[PDB]
Design a binder for this molecule. Sequence first.
Ligand SMILES: Nc1ncnc2c1ncn2[C@@H]1O[C@H](COP(=O)(O)OP(=O)(O)O)[C@@H](O)[C@H]1O
Ligand SMILES: Nc1ncnc2c1ncn2[C@@H]1O[C@H](COP(=O)(O)OP(=O)(O)O)[C@@H](O)[C@H]1O
Ligand SMILES: Nc1ncnc2c1ncn2[C@@H]1O[C@H](COP(=O)(O)OP(=O)(O)O)[C@@H](O)[C@H]1O
Lengths: 92, 436, 92, 435, 443, 132, 234
Amino acid sequence: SIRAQEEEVELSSDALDLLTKTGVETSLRYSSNLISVAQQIAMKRKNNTVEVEDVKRAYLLFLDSARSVKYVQENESQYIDDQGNVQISIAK
Amino acid sequence: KSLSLIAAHSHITGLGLDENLQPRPTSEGMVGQLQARRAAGVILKMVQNGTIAGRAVLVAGPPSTGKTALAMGVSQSLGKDVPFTAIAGSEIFSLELSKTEALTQAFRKSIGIKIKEETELIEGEVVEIQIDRSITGGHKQGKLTIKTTDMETIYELGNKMIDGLTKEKVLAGDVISIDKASGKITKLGRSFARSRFVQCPEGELQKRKTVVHTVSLHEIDVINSRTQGFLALFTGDTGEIRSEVRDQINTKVAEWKEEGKAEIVPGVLFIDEVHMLDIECFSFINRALEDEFAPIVMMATNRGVSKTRGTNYKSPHGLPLDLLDRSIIITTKSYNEQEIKTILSIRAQEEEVELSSDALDLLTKTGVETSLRYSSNLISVAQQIAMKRKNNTVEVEDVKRAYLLFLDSARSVKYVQENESQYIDDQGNVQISIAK
Amino acid sequence: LAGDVISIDKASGKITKLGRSFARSRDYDAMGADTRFVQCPEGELQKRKTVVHTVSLHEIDVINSRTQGFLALFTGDTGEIRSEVRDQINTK
Amino acid sequence: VTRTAAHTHIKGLGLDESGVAKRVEGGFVGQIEAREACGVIVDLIKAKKMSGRAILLAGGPSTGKTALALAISQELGPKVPFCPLVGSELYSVEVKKTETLMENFRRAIGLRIKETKEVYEGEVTELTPEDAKTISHVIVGLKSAKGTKTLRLDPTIYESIQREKVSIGDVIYIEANTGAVKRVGRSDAYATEFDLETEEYVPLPKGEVHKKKEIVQDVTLHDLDVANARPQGGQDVISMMGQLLKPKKTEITEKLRQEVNKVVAKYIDQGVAELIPGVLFIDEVNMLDIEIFTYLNKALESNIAPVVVLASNRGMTTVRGTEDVISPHGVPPDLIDRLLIVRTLPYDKDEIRTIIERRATVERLQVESSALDLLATMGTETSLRYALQLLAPCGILAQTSNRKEIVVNDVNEAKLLFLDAKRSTKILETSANYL
Amino acid sequence: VTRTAAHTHIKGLGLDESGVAKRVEGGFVGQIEAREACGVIVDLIKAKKMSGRAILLAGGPSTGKTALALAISQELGPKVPFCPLVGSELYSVEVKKTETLMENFRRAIGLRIKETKEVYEGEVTELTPEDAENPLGGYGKTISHVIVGLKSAKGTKTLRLDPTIYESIQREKVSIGDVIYIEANTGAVKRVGRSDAYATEFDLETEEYVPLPKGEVHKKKEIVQDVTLHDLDVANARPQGGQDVISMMGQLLKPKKTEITEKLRQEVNKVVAKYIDQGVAELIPGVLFIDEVNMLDIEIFTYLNKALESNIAPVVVLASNRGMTTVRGTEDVISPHGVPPDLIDRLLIVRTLPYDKDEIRTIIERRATVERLQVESSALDLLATMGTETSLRYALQLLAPCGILAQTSNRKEIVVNDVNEAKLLFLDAKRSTKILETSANYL
Amino acid sequence: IYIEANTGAVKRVGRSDAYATEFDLETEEYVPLPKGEVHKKKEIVQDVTLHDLDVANARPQGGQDVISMMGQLLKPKKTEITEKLRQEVNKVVAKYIDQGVAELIPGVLFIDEVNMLDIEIFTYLNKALESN
Amino acid sequence: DSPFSFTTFGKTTSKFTDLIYSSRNPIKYSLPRLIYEDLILPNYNNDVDIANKLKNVKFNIFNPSTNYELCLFLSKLTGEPSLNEFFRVSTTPLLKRVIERTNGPKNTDSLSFKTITQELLEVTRNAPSEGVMASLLNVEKHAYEREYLNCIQRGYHPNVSAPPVTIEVLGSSHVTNSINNELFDPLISQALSDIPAITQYNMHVKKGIPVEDFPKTGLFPEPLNKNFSSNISM
Ligand SMILES: Nc1ncnc2c1ncn2[C@@H]1O[C@H](COP(=O)(O)OP(=O)(O)O)[C@@H](O)[C@H]1O
Ligand SMILES: Nc1ncnc2c1ncn2[C@@H]1O[C@H](COP(=O)(O)OP(=O)(O)O)[C@@H](O)[C@H]1O
Ligand SMILES: Nc1ncnc2c1ncn2[C@@H]1O[C@H](COP(=O)(O)OP(=O)(O)O)[C@@H](O)[C@H]1O
């Protein structure tokens, strides 16, 4: 709340509770950047207040560390590993 | 001009190709490797069109199989007025320049700008000079008469050309080229008058000539960096040229090309033994290859599944696969006996060596047995043995004496393995004494 | 040149040239490279003012290591100042 | 005529007024979600309010990360600074790496200065200086093809006039705002005083003597830092040969940054300048040493730090400078907490075919549909970039046979001639002596 | 009388007209095949047509590899340039080893020149400078011209100096009553000294006195100069010798090696080409010798693989004494003589063979001849059986203690008891290793 | 004014305070009248180290060459002092204790946490402890 | 025995004879007119001079019109009685700061004091011989006079002497005047020379110019011997 007041961001109670839960699960700085991204998404809709839909859009668009680690570990053949091996082509 | 004794690739004068990009069996000093020569001709037409940029080509194959020969053929068939930079993999590990900065210099050295300008010049034959001076020399008047093989004139000169003529003293009988704008006096020499030696010029005295200028990007980057002058192009202390000056140069070349006062010529950068680079160099190279002002990079390597420097793993051709995705690979092959015989005959005609046919067949046999380079190196030694016994033609026993005297690789490995007790091993153990 | 703005100290004799007055701005028709236009000062000519300077020690060691040390202040090329200068500065 | 190098078909992010991307727009095929993220970051940057916000976009190789960064740079415009950078460039031999990181930070904060340009040039007809040994002023009369105009000048300018060796009858160039004096040469009317002369003769300027022009000057903060931090000293206007001592780069102290910030702050509130922050883009961020990654932490918390965009194509990789720190994308867990990760999905067959058609369009090549399907199957079988880089050899081999249009046989010939990575590796494995 | 140190008894290869080497002639013992190969390469470099030819001398320690290179140097004579080098010299702190490699590559190409010099010389008679109309105008010098009156044998010339010439006149501190030397190519000025036309012993500045120079004041002389391409490169890199500001400011600055670009080398090569096309210069290819090539590392070898393919590189001779040794700078690959195989393929290896007992005996005999020493036959046989027992070099360096111990006994010959005293006083490698193995506290 | 006898060498130390207020402004300082007579012999004692003498003789003194005032403006980069300079300073100093003018006071050089040094500086310390 | 002259000059193909310096380098770097006009010299279509002013004068941090507090702070630091000295230090090159250095007075109420090494230096300027401070401070000239170094011969001479590389631009006189000014700068060349004595007597007595208005001369360092002053050996 203090950071969003400092950044001049006007939210709802529901969006603040959702970002509080997000900062409980993930780290604090992920929500501290998510408020600034969701503010830009909020004036993209010609709306002055931050709702839960902007927070949900920013959450689906932007990833934290854990989701990136999971999505990397699911698709490890498409990334360059520690031994310089990568399956570039999509067809085997 | 361009002094040269005899080089290893001096017999190659270009890619031997027809008008349909097809390789001849033997043309312009190159034999064999038809598909590689066709691919290098495709590269040559790719550069000559010049409409695309930033494409990297890797040339890989066995050692001593036509790689640097292919690059020298491409450079010879490119001709003049096109920038061609031939660097090695170990030329970038500098102590005063960083590796990426040196790669940026080598990248920008291969893009030239073509500028056409005119300058009117006076060149003729000096017949008679008159100099009148005062006691203090405050006022000077002079007459200069000068001529060609066609015309005659007399010129009234001001005091500054009088000072610039008594400097770099012009006498009668001299051929002088005069620049009116900058006042530069150049003595071409003396003419044909027995009473060095050059001819009297013909045509008009006041000629207006145009010149075609070529200047690299790196020259303008050194000049537009105000911390050092143009002496850094010769001394080599450019010293970490910044990026905003490069931004100004890159904007101004586009501003010149849109007004039509300049044109851009692209060139070829050749990085020979590219496998000796570090990983940080390749990482710069993938992003440097997508620039507008980037040349066509030709890279040569011969290693196979080797450890990449700066890492701990192994990669094909010593290059990581992200670089290899941005490259199209030309592969060379080994040589037959007929192609080795043709190469040896070409190198025999090149070094002015006369051979017997049976000696040529012996050289072909020991070339397909041991190496091409060993046979190409013995052919100069055997000529010296032939002149040591005072005959012109090199015979079979002349080659045999050089084969006995001068050693090859595998034989020397065999005597090293036989007499390793008299050599220093990896552990630093040797035996010197012959007894006990 | 009779119209430039200067300031003179009485206790120390500090001499400066602040620039040229705006009354002489339309005079020379091309002001040139080494001049600057400032307003003519108002109010009382004779002014007393106490200002306080806080100076770090490293400023003193980098001034007294060379002949002109303020270029070493603003360019960072101090180059390993010795120890006798440090103990003399500590003593003083 | 025109040049392309793996880009220049990227014109923007292809978004509408609501921030939703089309399928094929702006030269981009597919990749919706990353384009929405890039458009939101562009809007955040255009908001001109934030410092130290970071973005890392990650994915497999040949997926379009550099294309997205270039689309960000094109959507932002040329007025806002954009600093492309490779992570390998920060290892310099003259200064430390943190110093070069700070200069690349402050290269991404620009300024907009409103200036004017007034110029006097033409024929010198009068050079009358007056004293009261020391001159008081010099009155110079200038003449052009549209009339004459006399001026009064100060002796400081008269010293440069004397330096330029200006006499009666020369054509000069006076910039009144700067004080620059330039000599062009003698007039064409004085060309017949001698038959041969060492001076160059120019005609009269065809315009007026006095010209006015409004200009806009863009400088970054790094230029103002390097202008006040010359170790040898200032330089003259014309310097064709450099100083006898070599000036190397030095680490610039924070005190000079504080004074430059004070000067720019004193110039902003008068309306003279306009502050424009920009983008520092670092490609291949996995190449960085751990100490640069730690100083990036302190540099991101500054009050003037720009928006930083990083890219990577690694997985569970040990960061350099360490031995047993397995971290995602080659970014340590301390720095990745402050980051925002945008993923980049790979492509299927139809988008690869669309990309091949789009790049064949921009290179002015005509391909049949049958060769297009072969190139699409080649791209999915081998690599997208391998199908990318075989277009121009196909054009050359088509133009060789007096054809303007690509057929299948040229694609097969270029397949036989040029190899990809996997065929070269197969030849490398089944070989005797170093391929 | 003379000084010797482990060499200089080798005077040459010592061959016939047909190249057949003798058994013992010219300080050489044995090594007939290696000496014949060295005669072949000597004739090859004297042929003056080949560029980029390379051989490697392979052999053990104490077998005569560096002796062959010195014999090549003396057989070529002093005129052909010879550049001795060590594999550890390539590592510089000032400049990278690549530029050091082509530094020594361009140091080994010789050149003559036939250069005309425009000389004004004589005795100065008067020194009258004239002043400017306004000297404190900021631009322009204080003076305008200087009148000098030069007197020589059968002639007297008066010259009007430039101010720029007068600066180099003044810097050598000339005065009336002196003999000078104006060299008009560069403006260089030599103060020859005080003339003998005035008094002699009335000075206090240890000056030397020169007679009046012969010939006219104005001269044109021909001077033959021997030069390399490297000296031209480093003169154009750091320009000194002119009369500008930068020429003085380069002579006072610290000299430092710099990374010479290829562009100046191409321009210098074009200038040398235009000199050789006018019939003035003649090109002398030389020999570059690198001893202990195994201490070179992988990037120097990789750059030398390019350096041998140039059209200006000279004949380069290498030497090593390793059998199966990994390359420096690499981790796992093993190559013969510490030289990677891609450079081995461009070489022409020359074997060097060890010696027998009689060869060691006659080498010790000729060595004791050269250092002016007299040996008994029994002591010579003891030295020969020691040279077979331990090493050739240990017996070769032991003879000067026999000379000292024979001198200190007021004797001229060397006896076996004297050799036994030199045995007990000084040790060898094997006895020291046996002492090290049977040692208490790392003795 | 200040005058030393055997050197001459007039030096200007300032203006008297009785000549301070004749002008409204003045830039120069005012040292007052010096205490004592116009002529006195003072015996001073000065404390310097051998390193001060080495660094004083090593750099060039006040000269008129452009190198001397060019390097005086530049960064004072440390350099490898030769043994010859130290030998000359030691012999002239020993001649001056032999004259009975200067006294030599050796002191203490103290290094703590000596595990941070490596074997190279240890070997040179072994060499240097045997000096005179 | 002389170094090889890598130069081209006016040679004769054979009441006074005037010789003018005309040594040039055989290597010529040919440069077009377009680069020099459009990137070095200012004109109406470029902004070289405007950017030079905006970087060197307006945004200069030592400007007394905008950073008077910083100027006062540095004046209290250095004790220098002019506030415009920092501007003149920062905006002229190195050698111009060298050759007109004047030993001006600094006020006592400052922080730049006398370093003990500088006091040890300043003691022994005019001190004569057999003084303890002078003899402890004159090691190098003692080694000069004891090793007989003033009568030693010269053993090394350079092989090639060459002038700097001449840059040529066809069709412009401004580049020629700029190059002649850079190569033969009268201020530096007067600093590297001396004035003749009769010329000085014409300055001071016959023209009324005082001694302190002279251009600074005699900054060239003296060679070791008379033999070491030249490269030409008899
Ligand atoms: N097609 C060819 N025509 C003529 N000479 C050739 C050809 N291929 C190879 N050579 C010769 O083989 C030698 C080795 O060639 P090069 O390409 O320089 O080595 P590498 O293959 O190791 O790069 C060269 O001296 C060259 O003269
Ligand atoms: N969505 C897309 N639409 C069109 N072209 C694309 C798209 N994505 C990638 N590309 C092309 O594919 C190439 C991938 O190269 P690059 O972006 O440098 O790889 P990386 O993403 O690993 O840095 C780019 O040159 C780009 O032109
Ligand atoms: N053929 C020879 N005749 C005479 N002396 C020799 C001969 N070969 C070697 N020597 C001696 O052996 C020593 C070692 O020779 P050198 O080539 O310098 O070193 P290495 O043989 O270890 O490379 C030399 O000092 C030389 O005097």
